[PDB]
Amino acid sequence: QSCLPNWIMHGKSCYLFSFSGNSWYGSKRHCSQLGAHLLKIDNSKEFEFIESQTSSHRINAFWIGLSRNQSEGPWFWEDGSAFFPNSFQVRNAVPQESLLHNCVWIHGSEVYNQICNTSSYSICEKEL
């Protein structure tokens, strides 16, 4: 069971920390070109691993595979599964301030909703 050069193994996955700026959509499509998807956080061990990387790279945020379709309405992971705050809650959460903030990125130790077209770094994930 292998990961590609420059991808990091943890748990049951391979990870690319992409230090390049893209909208959330551009990030999704970059991960897709690599046969991967934007990060889905599945458990606490996965979260703490990711967080140990994002908190050590806190100059930019990293787009992840979490988004909603309505400007407030349910968060869903890139595989279509529902969000549960098992490891973290999405931050910036009153009605008004959340307006058009429909995609999610990690910045340091915090997971934030954000305007989808914002240029940021990203994390891709592929199964080990």
Residues belonging to the binding site for a divalent metal cation are: 40, 42, 46, 125
CB of 65 to Cl ion, least distance (A): 4
Main-chain dihedrals φ then ψ at residue 37, nearest 5 degrees: -135, 160
Rounded Cα–Cα distance for residues 26 and 14 (Å)? 20
Q: How far is the CB of 70 from its own copies (least distance, A)?
A: 6
Alpha-carbon gap, residue 125 to 62, rounded angstroms = 13
Asked if 86 touches Cl ion (CB under 5 A), the answer is yes
Q: Which stretch binds Ca ion (CB under 5 A): 40-48, 54-62, 74-82, 100-108?
A: 40-48
Distances in Å between the alpha carbon of 24 and those of 1, 21, 124?
29, 9, 12
Q: Applying CB under 5 A, does 40 fall inside the site for Ca ion? A: yes
Closer by beta carbon to Ca ion, 33 or else 96: 33
